[model samples]
Target: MNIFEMLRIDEGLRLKIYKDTEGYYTIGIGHLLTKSPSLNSAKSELDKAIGRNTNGVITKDEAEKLFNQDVDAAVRGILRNAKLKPVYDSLDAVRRAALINMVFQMGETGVAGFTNSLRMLQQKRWDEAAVNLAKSRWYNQTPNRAKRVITTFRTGTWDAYK
Candidate 1:
């Protein structure tokens, strides 16, 4: 058997978190779970972890492939299972993208935590939703990115990106 197959046999396919020999948290095919700064940073943070370069740059096509598949599916799963499917489906293209981005960035629970913003969004209140987003801790942490999202929320356009 190949080394990968052997490793799978040895490591097993663990879905839940477990303690390793040194008592460090571990899960998923022997992937170590030490909390690195990069790993803890954000969903968008990937440089040293997923990139070959230091700062990490991915091509537009690569970005497209990333978002056009698993990311999209995972977000859909979150929306459906979290009972957000109805609310999410009612959004316009840009607003849908914005919601998907938020879910992917912070996960279902995180995005769902935005009850007020989501309430405004559910009414298609674009301006209010933008204002609502501005009141979030997410806005506080990442104003630059938040500005893009807020603008998109207000204008119902994806003009912040090319």
Candidate 2:
């Protein structure tokens, strides 16, 4: 499945779209935070928003539009409720995307529970951040996903594609 399809935004959530004169759109956050449609939609939305081309392939604007529909305040609420404020503040765009993915999967409390990782990241101790990132409950729970994200944190490259 395409990543967006894998995340199931199309079938899962009911979407409301808002557009500006500039042609930019934003998506509203759904009612369910952890379940299918909202979860999938959030993940897909973030994936497109970040514009990561994992396999040397460019993501289409159409793909981006699927998630880019003006839910910044809703998204910000999710991040704030997630206790991801500091992490968000400290991250570069790529790392921020990865963290958002993790937070989407794990919830704000889950992501925020990583006190040591947060500390390490705050210190700019890259190695420590990598280690702590892999040591979280998230890492233990979702090894492949955690590994991919932590690897991105360490390398600052999401895979050879821009």
Candidate 3:
């Protein structure tokens, strides 16, 4: 079987939370739910180890809501600190969208190190900035993605997604 099948088998596609064979309070395929009072706020959780409840399962909409809040915080934090924000805001809509894509992929930290590239972007020297972007390790690490970013970088134009 492929990865998702194997993972489903291993994690178990239960809509409910229950203790594993090792007896830890768990939910939705090995997502451990540790002890906390509010953890049971949804009425699906018992917050006790070594027990089972006939309580209804948590909704797919909010299996502890355990993931997205953290993700939201990170996206906000990264962009808030994204040193390129001012420049990004100053860009036209197309370049702004491309830069947003880059922030999503590279984070503020990744984009922060492109000193010369940042300078070129500031000066609207799209080709030089594109060359700088092409030389990064991220370009090599994600080759197919390279052409897309490189073209955007070179042209400062991103209409494809729009």
TM-score (all chains, Cα) for each model: 0.58, 0.52, 0.50
Q: Which portions of model 3 miss their true places by more than 4 Å?
A: 1-79, 159-162
Steric collisions counted per model: 0, 7, 0
10-103 per-residue lDDT for model 2 (tens digits) = 2233343323222333333222222233444545544465465222122344334444442333347446663567667877776666666555
Tens-digit lDDT string for candidate 1 (1-162): 222332343344544445554454444444444544343342233333335442334444444343345454646666675556766778876676666666644567777778888888888888878887888777887677678767767887656653
The parts of candidate 1 lying over 4 Å away from their true place are 1-70
Model 3 C-alpha RMSD vs. true structure (Å) is 11.0
Q: Indicate the residue-level lDDT of 104 in model 1.
A: 49
lDDT against the true structure, each candidate: 0.58, 0.52, 0.55
**Sort by TM-score, best first: what order?**
1, 2, 3
| Candidate 3 residue 128 C-alpha distance from true site, Å | 0.8
Off by over 4 Å in 2: 1-74, 78-83, 160-162
Roughly what TM-score does model 2 have, to 2 decimal places?
Answer: 0.52
Candidate 3 lDDT, 43-110, residue by residue in tens: 35433322445373655544324334433433464458646766665666556645645554455777
Query: For candidate 1, what is the lDDT?
Result: 0.58
Q: In candidate 3, residue 17 scores what lDDT?
A: 63
